[PDB]
């Protein structure tokens, strides 16, 4: 494939917060410090 533009959003979270990083979410990360849009196209890459 090819893409118009690309980003990497980089941060550290609790392993029990990885679920909040999916689009269409609620919880203190999803609400107050990192939200994804509904039409989100992209990938969440998460590891211990």
């Amino acid at each position: 494939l090819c893409f118009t533009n690309v980003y990497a959003d980089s941060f550290v979270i609790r392993g029990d917060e990885v679920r909040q990083i999916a689009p269409g979410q609620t919880g203190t990360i999803a609400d107050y410090n990192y939200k994804l849009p509904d039409d989100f196209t992209g990938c969440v890459i998460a590891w211990n």
């Binding site: 689009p23 269409g24 609620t26 509904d38």
Partner: protein
């Protein structure tokens, strides 16, 4: 859908689940207008 009343659904589901429940009401409703207008275009043809 979990109700006939469109606002109630918003009051219970997020943008991903409201979209499913609401798209039943849109599809069924749009099929209702596509039905009535067909019966009426036919009725009208009798009247002509």
């Amino acid at each position: 859908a979990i109700s006939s009343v469109l606002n109630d659904i918003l009051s219970r589901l997020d943008k991903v689940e409201a979209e499913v429940q609401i798209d039943r009401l849109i599809t069924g409703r749009l099929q209702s207008l596509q039905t009535y207008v067909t019966q009426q275009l036919i009725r009208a043809a009798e009247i002509r």
